[PDB]
Amino acid sequence: VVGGTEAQRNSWPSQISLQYRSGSSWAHTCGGTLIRQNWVMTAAHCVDRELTFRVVVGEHNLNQNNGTEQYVGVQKIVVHPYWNTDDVAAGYDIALLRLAQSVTLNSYVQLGVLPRAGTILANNSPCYITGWGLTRTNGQLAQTLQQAYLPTVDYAICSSSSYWGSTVKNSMVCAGGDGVRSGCQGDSGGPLHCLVNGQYAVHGVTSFVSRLGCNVTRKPTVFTRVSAYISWINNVIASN
Numbered sequence: 001v002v003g004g005t006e007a008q009r010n011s012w013p014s015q016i017s018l019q020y021r022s023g024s025s026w027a028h029t030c031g032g033t034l035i036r037q038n039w040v041m042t043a044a045h046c047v048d049r050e051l052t053f054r055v056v057v058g059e060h061n062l063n064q065n066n067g068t069e070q071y072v073g074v075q076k077i078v079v080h081p082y083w084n085t086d087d088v089a090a091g092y093d094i095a096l097l098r099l100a101q102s103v104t105l106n107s108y109v110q111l112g113v114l115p116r117a118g119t120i121l122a123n124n125s126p127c128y129i130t131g132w133g134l135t136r137t138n139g140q141l142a143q144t145l146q147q148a149y150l151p152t153v154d155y156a157i158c159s160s161s162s163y164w165g166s167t168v169k170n171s172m173v174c175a176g177g178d179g180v181r182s183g184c185q186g187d188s189g190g191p192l193h194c195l196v197n198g199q200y201a202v203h204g205v206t207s208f209v210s211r212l213g214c215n216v217t218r219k220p221t222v223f224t225r226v227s228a229y230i231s232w233i234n235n236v237i238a239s240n
């Protein structure tokens with residue numbers, strides 16, 4: 001997150017760290033939202049290489065034991081059948097990961113509240129992006145969880161000339177674009193939490209930023225609109 005601030009420890013307890021293996025060690029590659037005690041929602045582009053992944057729940061500082069972390073293997077990845085690696089701008093950037101075991105819930109590990117199908121937020125709706133990705137364009141990973149208030153830019157403004165144009169589809173949520181705050185690499189697959197009737201629910205799965213850098217004026221961060229995928233989500237958990 002560029003222009004963010006650090007988060008409280010138990011602030012966003014459905015945030016996870018999606019890590020892959022490097023040698024004996026593990027590196028954070030993406031975020032994700034715990035949706036079931038054995039299922040994580042993340043972006044499909046995060047599991048496009050055939051890596052060994054793991055999930056870390058209850059995480060706050062990546063480089064230091066917090067006393068709160070649970071670490072579980074990824075047993076099965078079900079990415080969206082229409083996802084195409086060569087074209088994020090087509091949309092469908094979503095994947096579900098079956099964990100090897102059920103994580104234990106406590107005040108650090110909670111399930112993410114998903115929106116109702118079809119739900120579209122109004123322009124300038126209050127949302128927060130969370131993640132351990134780059135703090136500057138071409139910078140480095142945050143070691144503690146960061147957060148920025150990232151208000152939505154609705155579809156009509158996001159797909160106008162001046163912003164993302166045709167690159168953004170209606171199955172996507174835009175948020176930010178002020179030139180100060182954004183999501184950035186390593187935040188991919190993470191949540192956009194938006195307050196809806198006194199409940200923060202996960203309306204976005206971070207998908208992409210501009211090629212000229214993370215915090216770019218009028219290129220808001222682009223998220224997969226979770227509410228366009230509620231039936232496929234539900235139909236995958238009932239299958240597996």
Ligand SMILES: CC(C)[C@H](NC(=O)C(F)(F)F)C(=O)N[C@@H](C)C(=O)Nc1ccc(C(F)(F)F)cc1
Nearest residue numbers: 089183184185186187188206207208209210211
């Ligand atoms: C999509 C992810 C690999 C990568 N995502 C992120 O950085 C994220 F964290 F914001 F989600 C990304 O946007 N990286 C930038 C550097 C990039 O490649 N952006 C990009 C934007 C649009 C398009 C296009 F037009 F094809 F859709 C292609 C690449």
Ligand SMILES: [Ca+2]
Nearest residue numbers: 061064065066
């Ligand atoms: Ca830690």
